[PDB]
Amino acid sequence: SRKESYSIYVYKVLKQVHPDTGISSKAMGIMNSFVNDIFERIAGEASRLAHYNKRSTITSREIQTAVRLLLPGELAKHAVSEGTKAVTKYTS
């Protein structure tokens, strides 16, 4: 049966930024772990945020707050400026 991983999107993104470069298989497992750790931290914090405010859904703002808590510094104001591109394009 199928096992499923993020392994292709990290490779796709590598060819976005370093078109000559590659990854060893052992160094893929790192990205395939890291990328789902940050998934869980955002899901867990966004879940608590909905609960504290006694909502049921989790709209964009329930995540933009979870990113603006969880990320340390310039990464917060960058990631917030990056995600507000994506939904602004999607809703056209």
Partner 1 sequence: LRDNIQGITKPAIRRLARRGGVKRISGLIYEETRGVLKVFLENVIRDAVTYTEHAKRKTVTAMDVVYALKRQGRTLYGFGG
Chain contacts with DNA (rule: CB under 7 A): 2-5, 7-8, 57
- For DNA, give the closer residue by CB, 2 or 89: 2
Q: How far apart are CA 28 and CA 10, in angstroms?
A: 8
**Residues 12 to 51 in contact with partner 1, rule: CB under 8 A:** 26, 29-30, 32-34, 36-37, 49
Note whether 23 and 51 are within 8 A (CB).
Answer: no
CB burial of 9-32 (b: ≥16 within 10 Å; e: otherwise) equals ebeeeeeeeeeeeeeeeeebeebe
Among 13, 38, 43, 69, binds partner 1 (CB under 8 A): 69
Q: Does residue number 79 form part of the binding site for partner 1 (CB under 8 A)?
A: no
User: How many secondary structure helices (H) and strands (E) does the chain include?
Assistant: 4, 0
- For partner 1, give the closer residue by CB, 25 or 92: 25
CB of 15 to partner 1, least distance (A): 22
